């Protein structure tokens, strides 16, 4: 049985700049397991009806997972533009899969500031779809940075610093993006 549970019920999620990816293969997929994971702030599929998923056979399912703030959930969608979509998690324009987000103020917001969830702030070139960039190289606007991030020296990751009293726009949201891949290889993720 496909371990969708392990994705959705994990203790902590990844920062979006270093998102996780669980390949999901050679398993029976019961997507009803998904439904029983608390009300979802977002459940917008792409190229597929969610209500038909047990009728479909895929050769891979990819499960990507990360945390972003509320207003940015808009950016987890094909063709999107901005800090998150262009530097952390780009989706391809022919995307077939689902994006599932939900408020996790309760598990990720802390009163002294949760600085462990980080986003990439800038990047000379955008990510190819599904690309991941774990870099932390300081950037020098000044024509000599060394280990000093100062005035014209810039660190490229920042911290959401979640706090329970932030408006729902800046609260932590757990995203699972599910990518259904269709090759000529015998389909190994099916219903029951």
């Amino acid at each position, epitope marked *: 049985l496909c371990p969708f549970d392990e994705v959705f019920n994990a203790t902590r999620f990844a920062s979006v700049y270093a998102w996780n990816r669980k390949r999901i293969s050679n398993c029976v997929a019961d997507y009803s397991v998904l439904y029983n994971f608390a009300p979802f702030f977002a459940f917008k599929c792409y190229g597929v009806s969610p209500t038909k998923l047990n009728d479909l056979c895929f050769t891979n399912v990819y499960a990507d997972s990360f945390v972003i703030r509320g207003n940015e959930v808009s950016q987890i969608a094909p063709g999107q*533009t901005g800090n998150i979509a262009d530097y952390n998690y780009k989706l391809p324009d022919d995307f077939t899969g689902c994006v599932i987000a939900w408020n996790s103020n309760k598990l990720d917001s802390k009163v002294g500031g949760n600085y462990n969830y980080r986003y990439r702030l800038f990047r000379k070139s955008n990510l190819k779809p599904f690309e991941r960039d774990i870099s932390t190289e300081i950037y020098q*606007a000044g024509n000599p940075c060394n280990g000093v991030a100062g005035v014209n020296c810039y660190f490229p990751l920042q911290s959401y610093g979640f706090r329970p009293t932030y408006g729902v726009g800046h609260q932590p949201y757990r995203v699972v993006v599910l990518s259904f891949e269709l090759l000529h290889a015998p389909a190994t993720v099916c219903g029951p």
Partner: single-chain antibody, 230 residues
Framework: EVQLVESGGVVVQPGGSLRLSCAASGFTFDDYAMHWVRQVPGKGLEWVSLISWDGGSRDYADSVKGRFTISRDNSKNALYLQMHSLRLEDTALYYC???????????????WGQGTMVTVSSVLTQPRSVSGSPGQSVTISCTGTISDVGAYNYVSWYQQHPGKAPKLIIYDVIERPSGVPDRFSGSKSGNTASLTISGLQAEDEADYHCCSYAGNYTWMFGGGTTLTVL
């Protein structure tokens, strides 16, 4: 140490054509997206065009599409804006701008040339003028849509004193570049972002402009004057 010198401004007849030029130095040009912004008579700051660090991506304001062509030549550290089919509406002071950060969607512009006047002859909403007294606290509105201000967390405010280019004083809704004193704060609710100034000095008798990312690869500004009553 960053220097942007514009050039090309001249009086042109409508229908005419003209090529503006930017020369860059003081940063690695090769990394940044480069923008053009114009200062229209009466109507404030107007974003024009931007071109990716390698010239492969170019976007344009609707008022300009398919009459203006942005381009660059990194070997010369240069950035050009070729103009065709010029119109009265295009009369403006044309600025050459580089954003604070690299990347195509950088939404904060801390570097501005002096601007090159371009004359042709044969919109987010801001209070026009606002007034406070030294020490009191004024605020300034910036109303857009859910596709510009209300859509993203990339709202910026720029200050401008006479004969100077815009100076970036607030970026990413609530951030302050080094040296901006903290009596300048910024906020955003719905499609309205606000610049608030406390502890009001008379050196804040100036003009104040906001800018938001507007989706696709596109930006928009406004226009507003403060008089510190003396």
């Amino acid at each position: 140490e960053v220097q942007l010198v514009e050039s090309g401004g001249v009086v042109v007849q409508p229908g005419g054509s003209l090529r503006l030029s930017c020369a860059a130095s003081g940063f690695t040009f090769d990394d940044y997206a480069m923008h053009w912004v114009r200062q229209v008579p009466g109507k404030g700051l107007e974003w024009v065009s931007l071109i990716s660090w390698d010239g492969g991506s170019r976007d344009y304001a609707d008022s300009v599409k398919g009459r203006f062509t942005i381009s660059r030549d990194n070997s010369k550290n240069a950035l050009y804006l070729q103009m065709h089919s010029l119109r009265l509406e295009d009369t403006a002071l044309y600025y050459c701008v580089r954003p604070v950060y690299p990347g195509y969607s950088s939404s904060e512009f801390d570097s501005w040339g002096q601007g090159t006047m371009v004359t042709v002859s044969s919109v987010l909403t801001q209070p026009r003028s606002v007034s406070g007294s030294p020490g009191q606290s004024v605020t300034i509105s910036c109303t857009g849509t859910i596709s510009d201000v209300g859509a993203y967390n990339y709202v910026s405010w720029y200050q401008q004193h006479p004969g100077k280019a815009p100076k970036l004083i607030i970026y990413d809704v609530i951030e302050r570049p080094s040296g901006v004193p903290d009596r300048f704060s910024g906020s955003k609710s719905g499609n309205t972002a606000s610049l608030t100034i406390s502890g009001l000095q008379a050196e804040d008798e100036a003009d104040y402009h906001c800018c938001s990312y507007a989706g696709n690869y596109t930006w928009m500004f406004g226009g507003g004057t403060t008089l510190t009553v003396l």
